[PDB]
Amino acid sequence: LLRCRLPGGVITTKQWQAIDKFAGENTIYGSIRLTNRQTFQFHGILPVHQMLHSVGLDALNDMNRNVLCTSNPYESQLHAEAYEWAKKISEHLLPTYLPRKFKTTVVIPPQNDIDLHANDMNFVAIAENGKLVGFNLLVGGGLSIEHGNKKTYARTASEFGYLPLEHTLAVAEAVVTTQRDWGNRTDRKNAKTKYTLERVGVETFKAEVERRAGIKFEPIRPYEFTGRGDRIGWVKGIDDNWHLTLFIENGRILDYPARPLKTGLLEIAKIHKGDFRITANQNLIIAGVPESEKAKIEKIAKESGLMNAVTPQRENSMACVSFPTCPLAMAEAERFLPSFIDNIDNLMAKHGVSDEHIVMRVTGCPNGCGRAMLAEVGLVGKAPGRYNLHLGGNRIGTRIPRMYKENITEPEILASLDELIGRWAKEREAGEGFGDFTVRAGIIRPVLDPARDLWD
Numbered sequence: 300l301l302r303c304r305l306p307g308g309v310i311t312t313k314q315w316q317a318i319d320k321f322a323g324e325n326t327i328y329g330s331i332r333l334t335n336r337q338t339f340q341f342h343g344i345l346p347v348h349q350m351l352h353s354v355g356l357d358a359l360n361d362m363n364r365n366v367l368c369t370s371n372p373y374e375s376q377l378h379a380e381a382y383e384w385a386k387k388i389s390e391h392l393l394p395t396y397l398p399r400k401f402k403t404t405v406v407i408p409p410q411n412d413i414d415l416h417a418n419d420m421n422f423v424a425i426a427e428n429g430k431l432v433g434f435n436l437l438v439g440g441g442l443s444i445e446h447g448n449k450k451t452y453a454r455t456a457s458e459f460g461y462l463p464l465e466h467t468l469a470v471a472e473a474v475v476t477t478q479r480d481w482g483n484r485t486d487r488k489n490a491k492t493k494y495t496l497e498r499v500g501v502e503t504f505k506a507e508v509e510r511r512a513g514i515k516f517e518p519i520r521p522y523e524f525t526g527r528g529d530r531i532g533w534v535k536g537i538d539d540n541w542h543l544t545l546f547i548e549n550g551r552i553l554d555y556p557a558r559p560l561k562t563g564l565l566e567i568a569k570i571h572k573g574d575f576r577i578t579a580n581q582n583l584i585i586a587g588v589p590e591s592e593k594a595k596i597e598k599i600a601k602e603s604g605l606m607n608a609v610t611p612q613r614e615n616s617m618a619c620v621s622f623p624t625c626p627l628a629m630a631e632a633e634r635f636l637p638s639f640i641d642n643i644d645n646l647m648a649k650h651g652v653s654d655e656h657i658v659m660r661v662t663g664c665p666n667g668c669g670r671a672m673l674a675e676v677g678l679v680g681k682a683p684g685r686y687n688l689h690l691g692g693n694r695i696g697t698r699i700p701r702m703y704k705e706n707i708t709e710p711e712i713l714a715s716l717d718e719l720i721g722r723w724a725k726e727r728e729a730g731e732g733f734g735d736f737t738v739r740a741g742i743i744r745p746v747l748d749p750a751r752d753l754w755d
């Protein structure tokens with residue numbers, strides 16, 4: 300199990316060819332697994348560092364995870380600057396020994412594809428006239444919980460304030476250091492930033508950050524999110540360039556009979572001008588394709604099965620690795636999702652909502668890697684074939700879903716969703732999401748202050 304440091308998920312075609320080779324020749328599974336933190340993993344490594352180092356990649360005493368960056372902004376020109384900053388924060392934070400692992404992101408509204416509320420530190424980009432002028436800082440997100448332990452909880456990030464671009468690194472360092480200093484020294488399950496904030500208070504923590512950074516936060520500048528999904532298919536970028544985002548189920552890249560996904564990506568990498576971008580939804584973007592090259596790229600993706608059409612539901616569903624490789628797995632996630640979504644697709648069709656989607660995620664255990672604690676419908680593994688069903692998040696991911704039913708099986712889960720999707724399809728207002736509806740309709744009480752009301 301090896302994972303690479305790849306800020307913003309940007310990887311070159313040369314780097315791709317190198318990782319594709321190693322994956323096929325030096326691992327048990329032979330696959331490339333795209334993660335939801337915009338990087339990749341090999342499974343069952345049978346030397347990798349030399350391979351990495353040779354193509355300029357470095358495999359991550361360091362409590363630091365991959366720094367995320369919105370992959371395909373509507374305003375395409377903003378990506379270059381934002382990415383530049385994600386890369387700088389990444390290198391800046393690179394080795395202090397943090398108690399727990401620290402997760403950071405750079406977000407470009409109105410997209411929350413990187414799922415900011417699952418992270419310790421977030422810089423929401425504010426642009427004026429096509430140029431980034433600063434960041435709104437949100438601190439304190441985290442999703443890991445422990446079954447039945449009411450002292451643990453998922454928490455959304457808190458707004459601290461706005462800072463000019465020039466203060467970015469000073470602020471990044473200051474948040475890291477006060478968490479390091481104030482973080483719980485006695486217990487690891489309470490060492491994360493979300494716990495520290497609740498213990499000392501946001502304002503107390505905020506004041507310390509200003510003190511250390513040598514700045515005073517300005518008031519938060521307006522920002523809104525409209526979604527978290529990728530933009531599957533072709534989208535027009537800057538100049539004569541186009542971006543093709545490929546939906547990859549579970550981000551598992553392998554050649555399947557009649558679906559040579561892995562070889563197809565290699566062929567594209569051989570002729571692709573620009574580079575690739577691994578998304579926070581475990582998908583892949585063939586970035587910067589000249590209009591002249593569109594048909595060539597599309598031909599390979601099409602033939603390889605990389606452009607096989609799926610429902611909007613499937614495009615908005617996610618699961619963690621879980622079995623067979625995860626040592627902490629309680630229930631299947633990745634291997635369960637495909638057939639589970641097959642069933643949800645039938646349910647959506649039955650109720651006349653085949654064109655709709657519900658952000659649905661399955662996580663193999665409460666550690667929460669699948670980000671089910673930010674979904675409209677989240678399934679959390681409790682034991683083989685059994686999950687806790689959570690309802691009530693929203694499409695943009697700013698609300699934690701409360702547990703609706705505990706320790707139930709797939710058949711029981713489907714029966715409940717059949718009933719609820721049916722009600723939503725008929726009783727929902729115009730453009731109302733499933734999560735919001737369950738809260739509006741009184742099907743589940745919302746989680747308003749996680750540290751205090753997440754658990755019944």
Ligand code: SRM
Nearest residue numbers: 334335336338417441442443618619620624625666667668
């Ligand atoms: C691959 C990935 C899920 C996926 O299907 O994409 C993943 C996979 C695993 N995670 Fe994670 N996590 C992944 C995103 C996350 C997320 C979501 C996110 O960051 O966007 C979370 C929830 C947010 C959070 O941190 O609160 C998450 C919370 C955890 C935890 C709980 C940490 C905690 O604070 O309590 C653990 C266990 C631990 O580290 O103690 C963990 C542990 C693990 C390990 C490395 C298991 C281990 O400790 O040995 C899993 C490897 C499974 C395997 O065989 O590949 N993973 N994990 C993601 C890899 C991200 C990356 O490239 O770094």
Ligand code: SF4
Nearest residue numbers: 619625628663664668
């Ligand atoms: S949520 Fe649990 S089962 Fe899934 S990858 Fe994370 S640690 Fe493993």
Ligand SMILES: [K+]
Nearest residue numbers: 547549580581
């Ligand atoms: K995916």
